[PDB]
Amino acid sequence: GLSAAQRQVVASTWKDIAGADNGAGVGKECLSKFISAHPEMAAVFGFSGASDPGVAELGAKVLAQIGVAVSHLGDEGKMVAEMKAVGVRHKGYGNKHIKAEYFEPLGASLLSAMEHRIGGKMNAAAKDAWAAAYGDISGALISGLQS
Ligand code: HEM
Numbered sequence: 001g002l003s004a005a006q007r008q009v010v011a012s013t014w015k016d017i018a019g020a021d022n023g024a025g026v027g028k029e030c031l032s033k034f035i036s037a038h039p040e041m042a043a044v045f046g047f048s049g050a051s052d053p054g055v056a057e058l059g060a061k062v063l064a065q066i067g068v069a070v071s072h073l074g075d076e077g078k079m080v081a082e083m084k085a086v087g088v089r090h091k092g093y094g095n096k097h098i099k100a101e102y103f104e105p106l107g108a109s110l111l112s113a114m115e116h117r118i119g120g121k122m123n124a125a126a127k128d129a130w131a132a133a134y135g136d137i138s139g140a141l142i143s144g145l146q147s
């Protein structure tokens with residue numbers, strides 16, 4: 001899915017993205033900005049809006065799971081199996097009509113929140129590698145969702 005160079009860039013910058021809170025703050029900003037920009041998504045998640053307490057709670061769980069996916073990146077089948085299981089659980093989440101179309105704008109909010117945290121370290125190579133990693137992580141979740 002990712003080249004060895006891309007996996008090494010993702011693994012390296014993940015230390016800076018995780019910070020001291022296992023990426024919790026990045027998760028809150030990712031989902032906050034996503035729902036503010038796409039207000040119709042609040043109903044899909046089951047939140048009142050961008051300021052719902054649940055946004056910060058769920059943002060931390062998303063980023064903690066990406067941290068687990070990053071630790072398994074060198075074994076593709078292992079990473080895919082885990083995320084596929086997360087995907088199967090999403091059949092019963094929110095409005096229970098989570099669509100594949102929703103994951104691409106979420107990816108854009110995620111990379112923006114990562115950049116907001118690590119600044120200049122989120123350079124062109126870092127953005128390409130994380131766009132590739134997000135494609136595979138969310139692609140594996142979507143396959144579980146649609147299984
Ligand atoms: C726009 C697409 C998405 C929607 C609408 C969505 C929705 C939800 C909802 C509503 C919950 C709360 C479940 C509960 O009440 O317990 C949840 C949990 C979770 N989501 Fe998502 N999600 C999406 C994308 C993602 C992505 C990309 C990841 C990837 C890391 C992810 C990882 C998780 C995790 C780790 C949980 C916690 C529960 C579990 O492990 O299954 N979600 N999601």
Ligand SMILES: [C-]#N
Pocket residue numbers: 058059062
């Ligand atoms: C998913 N939150």
